[PDB]
Structures are given as structure tokens and as C-alpha cells.
Write a protein that binds this ligand. Structure first.
Ligand SMILES: [Cl-]
Ligand SMILES: [Cl-]
Length: 129
């Protein structure tokens, strides 16, 4: 599913991400924009041979099992395919663990390089939320 910007903002808010670990909703929308272009089906191989999955590009080395990544810890206890559903519940529940690992949203390289230090509230401007 390719979400509209405000559609994804509303689903992330409903699932509890607004101000989760202190990160306002625009941070999560900005991250999803640059990670997946709002597309739940996005998959991308990483340099290390892991793969990133879903709207928030969650990786198979630590967080989900894809059957093809050495060292997989599957800390979210899910097949990586569950992260590609039109329903974002699994991605949100896992992202809540990722952002709790110690480095906050710096766990998402695209957030650090493209959202951090910017006007992230722009990503929810115009939304009826
Ligand atoms: Cl709808
Ligand atoms: Cl933090």
C-alpha cells in the first residue's frame, strides 16, 4: 500500500507514535518519506547483506527474520514479510522497540541524514489529525 502523507500520519498517531520516546509525529512521517516513500511494500538490501523492510525500513539483522541474514536476532519476533502489510501495526510495534535501543531515531540513517535538524512539523502540515 502506498499511503498518503496525512493518511500515514493518522495511522502512526493511532498506533501511538506521536511523542513516543519524545519524537513528535512529523519525525516519524519524515523518516517514512525518505525510507520508503510511504510504501509498505518497500524492500532494500543493505550493505551488510541484511535487508530493510516496510514503511520504516526495519532491518533483518536485528529486528525481523527473513531467513537469509547471518546473525539475525529477530528482536521483534516477526517474519520480515509481516512488515510489508497494508496494516502498519507490526511495523509500528517494532519501531517502538528500535527507537528504545539507546540512540533514539538515529537508528534510522535516513532520519539522521535527512530529517534531524529540519522543520519536521512540515510533514504533518495540512493534515486533519
Ligand atoms: Cl481510506
Ligand atoms: Cl532521544
Amino acid at each position: 500500500k502506498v499511503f498518503g502523507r496525512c493518511e500515514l500520519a493518522a495511522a502512526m498517531k493511532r498506533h501511538g507514535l506521536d511523542n513516543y520516546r519524545g519524537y513528535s509525529l512529523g519525525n516519524w512521517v519524515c523518516a517514512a518519506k525518505f525510507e520508503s516513500n510511504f510504501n509498505t511494500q518497500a524492500t532494500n538490501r543493505n550493505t551488510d547483506g541484511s535487508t530493510d523492510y516496510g514503511i520504516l525500513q526495519i532491518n533483518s539483522r536485528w529486528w525481523c527474520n527473513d531467513g537469509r541474514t547471518p546473525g539475525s536476532r529477530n528482536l521483534c519476533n516477526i517474519p520480515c514479510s509481516a512488515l510489508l502489510s497494508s496494516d502498519i501495526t507490526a511495523s509500528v510495534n517494532c519501531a517502538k522497540k528500535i527507537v528504545s535501543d539507546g540512540n533514539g531515531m538515529n537508528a534510522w540513517v535516513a532520519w539522521r541524514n535527512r530529517c534531524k535538524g529540519t522543520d519536521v512539523q512540515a510533514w504533518i502540515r495540512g493534515c486533519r489529525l
